[PDB]
């Protein structure tokens, strides 16, 4: 059998308030988790995840093939050359099980300066017809802001954990320009399940998605209650238990870069499970021009031998690298 990963539940509610000592006690827990397996569950986060799950189910189960083509990213529909990130990512029956819908900052409107400039990684979201999916767009945009709020609170905790003032990361995470995305992923129950959608790891584990580090500052993830994730530790791959009341948090490779690998981006993978389930990540991305000077909290003078990297450069290159390594989702 596989051992269970140490993934503590951390009450993050103090990060929304003004009790500075209580915030430090949360920051310590974040520090400990970040230095151990790299994962923790945020609890007492204030988001109605049951409703998120319900609204997402209604969307995934009602969208039709016609609509999926009309919303498809360029990888599936050559007519949509402006859709690299935002839109529908189709399943391929008999070959690829997973399907998903990605959306970006609702403030990326046609008149936004970065949209006007055609800056890479910025796009205007695409949405299904309101009459076919009543309330969906409004729900989804509001969810973006609810999880943005949680994420800003978590970033205050990571900053305090690293010995910085609480706005160290959050000052770069702004509603007008964040490159953060929500992805609503459907992992289906299929009978029979196509073997081509099942990968096998070197250790023999059947997978839906291979090992990787995240392209993010941090990742803020809701999943259904079906165990699927594993994290690589010194003791090998360990199972991360599901908790459909909490958000699973981990660092991405931009955090690892900034901290000189003090807070590593944990390597993780997704086991194959033949169950109808949801994986709904929010990738906490900064602005296109955001640069945080790398440091090293294990060094007395705090200095690191890494060169500064703008977030936009990091992101554009990382999203491409993911596709090249683990395939187009
Ligand atoms: C493991 C889960 C978290 C989830 O995987 C992802 O969400 C993957 N994410 C992506 O493929 C990047 C999507 C980027 C998005 N299209 C964007 O433009 O921002 C992993 C590499 S983290 C899952 O498979 O359950
Ligand atoms: Fe990931």
From Swiss-Prot:
Disulfide bonds: none
Biological process terms in GO annotation: penicillin biosynthetic process
Positions of isopenicillin N binding: 85, 89, 181, 187, 279
Entry binding sites for 2-oxoglutarate: 277
Pfam families: 2OG-FeII_Oxy (PF03171), DIOX_N (PF14226)
Enzyme Commission code(s) on record: 1.21.3.1
Reactions catalysed: N-[(5S)-5-amino-5-carboxypentanoyl]-L-cysteinyl-D-valine + O2 = isopenicillin N + 2 H2O
Family matches, as InterPro entries: DIOX_N, IPNS-like_FE2OG_OXY, IPNS-like_sf, Isopenicillin-N_synth_CS, Oxoglu/Fe-dep_dioxygenase_dom
Sites where the protein binds N-[(5S)-5-amino-5-carboxypentanoyl]-L-cysteinyl-D-valine: 85, 89, 181, 187, 212, 214, 279
Marked site (Transition state stabilizer) residue numbers: 209
Record-listed Fe(2+) binding positions: 212, 214, 268
Record pathway: Antibiotic biosynthesis; penicillin G biosynthesis; penicillin G from L-alpha-aminoadipate and L-cysteine and L-valine: step 2/3
Main subcellular location of this protein, as a coarse class: cytoplasm
Location of this chain's protein in the cell: Cytoplasm, Cytosol
Gene Ontology CC annotation, any one: cytosol
Assembly information from the UniProt record: Monomer.
Function (record text): Isopenicillin N synthase; part of the gene cluster that mediates the biosynthesis of penicillin, the world's most important antibiotic. IpnA catalyzes the cyclization of the tripeptide N-[(5S)-5-amino-5-carboxypentanoyl]-L-cysteinyl-D-valine (LLD-ACV or ACV) to form isopenicillin N (IPN) that contains the beta-lactam nucleus. The penicillin biosynthesis occurs via 3 enzymatic steps, the first corresponding to the production of the tripeptide N-[(5S)-5-amino-5-carboxypentanoyl]-L-cysteinyl-D-valine (LLD-ACV or ACV) by the NRPS acvA.
Protein name, UniProt field: Isopenicillin N synthase
Gene: ipnA
């Amino acid at each position: 059998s596989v051992s269970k990963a140490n993934v503590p539940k951390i009450d993050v509610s103090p990060l929304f308030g003004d009790d500075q000592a209580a915030k430090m006690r949360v920051a310590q827990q974040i520090d400990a988790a970040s230095r151990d397996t790299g994962f923790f569950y945020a609890v007492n986060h204030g988001i109605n995840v049951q409703r998120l799950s319900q609204k997402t189910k209604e969307f995934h189960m009602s969208i039709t093939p016609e609509e999926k083509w009309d919303l498809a990213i360029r990888a599936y529909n050559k007519e949509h050359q402006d859709q690299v990130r935002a839109g529908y990512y189709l399943s391929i029956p008999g070959k690829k099980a997973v399907e998903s819908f990605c959306y970006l900052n609702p403030n990326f409107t046609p008149d936004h300066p970065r949209i006007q400039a055609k800056t890479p990684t910025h796009e205007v979201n695409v949405w299904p017809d309101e009459t076919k999916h009543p309330g969906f767009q409004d729900f989804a945009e509001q969810y973006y802001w609810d999880v943005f709020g949680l994420s800003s609170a978590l970033l205050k905790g990571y900053a305090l954990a690293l010995g910085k003032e609480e706005n160290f990361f959050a000052r770069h995470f702004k509603p007008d320009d964040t490159l953060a995305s929500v992805v609503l992923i459907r992992y289906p129950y299929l009978d029979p399940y196509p073997e081509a959608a099942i990968k096998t790891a070197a250790d023999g584990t059947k997978l839906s998605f291979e090992w990787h580090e995240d392209v993010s500052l941090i990742t803020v993830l809701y999943q259904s209650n079906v165990q699927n994730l594993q994290v690589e530790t010194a003791a090998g791959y360990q199972d991360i238990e599901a908790d459909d009341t909490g958000y699973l948090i981990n660092c991405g490779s931009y955090m690892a870069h900034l901290t000189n690998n003090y807070y590593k981006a944990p390597i993780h993978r997704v086991k194959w499970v033949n169950a109808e389930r949801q994986s709904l990540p929010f990738f906490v991305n900064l602005g296109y021009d955001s640069v945080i000077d790398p440091f090293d909290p294990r060094e007395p003078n705090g200095k690191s031998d890494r060169e500064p990297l703008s977030y936009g450069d990091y992101l554009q290159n990382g999203l491409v690298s993911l596709i090249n390594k683990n395939g187009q989702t």
